[PDB]
Amino acid sequence: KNDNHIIQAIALLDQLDKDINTFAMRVKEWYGWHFPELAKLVPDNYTFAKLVLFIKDKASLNDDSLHDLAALLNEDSGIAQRVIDNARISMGQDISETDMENVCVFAQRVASLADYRRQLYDYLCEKMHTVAPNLSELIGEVIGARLISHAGSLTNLSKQAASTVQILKNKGRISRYLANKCSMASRIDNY
């Protein structure tokens, strides 16, 4: 019946996603100083950090390199041959090996952060099935944890009435219906 694990996990989840996006934008900035056309070729930030970790510097472009950065996700969107061409003919300002080391350490940092986010979300889903399974089955694990964090505790959520849970034509009908059933689910899951 402790639920502060749920509350802390939610706060950590949203701060973790925001920080993932910020640090991925920073990796985008620095490796765009080195080579901006990759930053406009792969907008996917996690794969961008991985691809920076592979192609640290833009000189190593072989066919085995082609195959390895093809195994990096895929070939079907031409990204491998396109980045070979664009890193052969790029306008990229070259930087130092120390800056390259700091860039790749930063990209490794971002990859580890994304791994931690995935692990934390799975742990949150497990703890939600542990603590409040009816509410989690009713609305959802993430959304139920959002409701619990908005309230303050499962005790607060079950103590409040149904209209307050709602503020926590057939669209309005379904909203009120789901709010009342959510309130009953929180009652049974707390007590």
Next chain:
Amino acid sequence: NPKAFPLADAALTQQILDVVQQAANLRQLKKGANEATKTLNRGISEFIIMAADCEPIEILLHLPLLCEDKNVPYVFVPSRVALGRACGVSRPVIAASITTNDASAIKTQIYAVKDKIETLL
């Protein structure tokens, strides 16, 4: 020094230092690199006289940027000691600024020397 590009010849130095001395007596003159930079940012400088044998040259080479950015005439003279004696202070000044005033007795000489500097540029 090629970085000191407009460097005055002898007669031009003589005219410039005489105008500096009269402007100092009337106190239409601001002395020093920081004070000249402040006058340039204020936009109240008539024109700029710099030294050439300053040790080193960059600490006043920062000035031509602002000088033609606000389109002010500037010139280099050889001796900072000569510039200090002409300014009338006991220390060698490396950069002085004649300010703008038209209720001034030396407006004609100021305009003549400024025109000659501008022609040299």
Next chain:
Amino acid sequence: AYVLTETSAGYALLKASDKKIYKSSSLIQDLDSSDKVLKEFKIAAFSKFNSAANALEEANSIIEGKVSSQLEKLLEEIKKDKKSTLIVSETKLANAINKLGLNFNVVSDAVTLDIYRAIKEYLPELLPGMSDNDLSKMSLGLAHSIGRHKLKFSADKVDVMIIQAIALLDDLDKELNTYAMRCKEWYGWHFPELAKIVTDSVAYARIILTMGIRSKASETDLSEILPEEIEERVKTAAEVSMGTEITQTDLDNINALAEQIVEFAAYREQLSNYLSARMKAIAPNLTQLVGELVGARLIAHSGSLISLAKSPASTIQILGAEKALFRALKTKHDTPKYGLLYHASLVGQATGKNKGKIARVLAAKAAVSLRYDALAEDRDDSGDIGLESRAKVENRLSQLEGRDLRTT
């Protein structure tokens, strides 16, 4: 006759009628900039230089000045007879390839702007010849590399990188602090007297990494994390705590969070050291004078180093406390006299009125050292001007300190 042309992708050579001057006259006088004349004269020998950008740049610099080995291994078999004539446009290149070893005859920048201009016109028709591409990006990247080398851009002097580094340092400190707050109040369900008695985020996370539960901490030693009095303090706290018991799964995830904390702190330290190296590589005299952190903060306030150079000295003295400056100017109070130089070592070494006077003197000498570091076209990168200016400020500080106030 042969004619040489420089492209952004390779060196090309074209054979034509041996009376090449009269051929160019026919070109212009029949308006032969068209595909008819270009299919009359497509190519003789192509040589695409390789996919190595440094080789591109050095090859182009040697095209501007001299003759390269790439030109040699192109020029191994231009000829069949002992004498053949070649059209070239650079006169220095003309006498160079006259002086080289094959000794075949060449013609300099003659009337053959006809030839060069027409083949640059319908060089699109030469693109199906050897280079099936669009060389706009080729010329773009080549021009950027050539401009980099002509400006002689040292790869370590990058003020945009130093402002990015200081902003990332501040962001890292903020996010590390909020993650430490999160981890502290998550572990506070198990050991709140520790959460009070220690305040280092890193010592907190290292304790979470070594021990997990209170009596495990009581049997585990904690010498390398904390001193003896504080570790026995947390021994007593572990004896009489108040928190619940944590399952192994929650202990695992809070342990992963603690690992993220200590790795963040280690990376922040490493990045601060990298920033120090960047300051010493970019503006060494200012590092010698004011100190690395305050130098980076001044540059980040000003934006670019050259904008900071264009600023005068008094703005450098009060570069930080601009709010106090403008408010005091409007309401007729006294201006701030420290700003952002206050955290420099010499201003921290002085005291009171000596602090104000040393801030003034050091701001003036900092403007001097800074202008030299920004505008030195060549620079020994030693630290000489900064060191002698620091000596001047040190003599001024010693004199000002020795001068007392009360009549003895």
Next chain:
Amino acid sequence: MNRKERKSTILETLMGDEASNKYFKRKYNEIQEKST
């Protein structure tokens, strides 16, 4: 409350309110006419 009404000063949000504004100009015109 709102976000576009959250103003950094109690006097600022007071004069940002409008019913107070018409009441204030009404009563001020009344007392000013009484003064003159």
Next chain:
Amino acid sequence: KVVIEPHRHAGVYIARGKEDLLVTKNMAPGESVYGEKRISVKVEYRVWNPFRSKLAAGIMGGLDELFIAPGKKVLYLGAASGTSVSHVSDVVGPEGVVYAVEFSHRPGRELISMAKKRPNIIPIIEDARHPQKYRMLIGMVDCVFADVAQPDQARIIALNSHMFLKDQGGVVISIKANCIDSTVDAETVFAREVQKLREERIKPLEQLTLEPYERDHCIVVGRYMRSG
């Protein structure tokens, strides 16, 4: 609240709102390359200032034929920190290209920053007097514009036009008699430089004196004809 009216030159527009403006499009969204204020209406837009760009003064004065169309390649002599060549890049758009040429070093680095932003500008830090020295990177430009303030302006323009310009092309020059002669009548200087260009085979069509925006400045527009 801001009406966009297309100018008679393809690429330039006019903002008719509270305060009327001469505007161009953007290719770098959300980045004013020198501090000008940008508008949007959505499509981003960015204003030319006549007091900073001689091309802006010319267009605002009214011009018959400006040979810089969107689908073209234009060469710029003397891009002083690029504050006009960014606007010319946005006028041209990605279909064409612009070769900026600078020699002096600090606006050289400014131009490197701007050309690292935009893909239409390519920078040449080589001095403008030697087309044999920078003859590799540029091929058969369509229009040529000149901002150079050196007294051998007609000769360097004739050299660059002989070595790079497509025949029947467009040549636009900005010229200041306070640089070239600075003691005699500006109209006489303009007749003299026109005679120089006619000697150097440029057939001039128009000239315009940018009087309310600058003092003692003309801009000449002519065709490059009958050459190879």
Next chain:
Amino acid sequence: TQDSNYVRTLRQIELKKLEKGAKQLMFKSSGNHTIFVDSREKMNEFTPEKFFNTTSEMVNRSENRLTKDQLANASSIMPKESLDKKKLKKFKQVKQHLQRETQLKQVQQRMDAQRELLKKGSKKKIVDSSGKISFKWKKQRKR
């Protein structure tokens, strides 16, 4: 009442605001546009309407001398009365900025003269027959 620091601050404030206003404003052109015609008969038969293929309003305006083939403000409230009023409001705002700026310059200059005459030198109070007071420092290198 006030001080040189306050006047200096206000002058720089108004100078920068006037600069931003002049950057936002728009000035109409006035130039000596010439056209270079080959032959004297074409000089004699030249007309601007045919040379620019515009209309009368389009040729007497110089910004938009649009093609007739290119030809091939009533959206805002009170077009003939309010929009021009707002543009004249912007113009008079810039003008008011400029006059307040130069008045602050005059006050700053008088305060500076008083401060120098208080400050330093060996000065003789000279009066000029236009009634104007100057102070003559004797030539002496200040140490």
Next chain:
RNA sequence: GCGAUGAUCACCCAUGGGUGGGUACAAAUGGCAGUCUGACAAGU
């Protein structure tokens, strides 16, 4: 084959779009917003 474990309850063009508003985050070389004084001081 109902219900207290909860029934019922701003504009235009014809259930489609345009105009306005609220919420969270992000960017800005967007605004507030302007960079102090300027020759003497210390010992005898």
